[PDB]
Ligand binder design. Structure first.
Ligand code: A1IAB
Ligand code: MG
Length: 103
């Protein structure tokens, strides 16, 4: 698959990005007050890595949906001027531009 090929490329670059530190592992709701109540479908890069490794993505569209979920959730829970929120805007702009320079 040429679609799955670029997903592996763009996931690799996001995992290694400087501003990827809030998204490398799932949020622990025990450690974050209100997260469980506010974020219905959590998502992060390791969950995407796991689903790609086991062949769980059909098309590149499903991969893009999970990536946009990460940043949608980030903007739903975190203030735009929080540390986590600022890293998410950097990561979201990176993904949007990189995804469009291929498709
Ligand atoms: C609540 C929220 O939307 C959020 C997201 C999407 N991500 C983070 C976040 O901060 N992390 C992600 C999980 C691991 C955390 C981690 N990994 N190694 C050490 C730490 C400790 N953190 C806390 C402060 C210093 C780093 C970092 C939040 C709050
Ligand atoms: Mg959107």
């Amino acid at each position: 698959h040429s679609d799955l090929t670029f997903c592996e490329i763009i996931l690799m670059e996001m995992e290694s990005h400087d501003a990827a530190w809030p998204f490398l592992e799932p949020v622990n709701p025990r450690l974050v007050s209100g997260y469980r109540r506010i974020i219905k479908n959590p998502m992060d890069f390791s969950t995407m890595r796991h689903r790609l490794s086991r062949g769980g993505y059909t098309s590149s569209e499903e991969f893009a949906a999970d990536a946009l979920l990460v940043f949608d959730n980030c903007q739903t829970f975190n203030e735009d001027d929080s540390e986590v929120g600022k890293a998410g805007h950097i990561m979201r702009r990176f993904f949007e531009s990189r995804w469009e320079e291929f498709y």
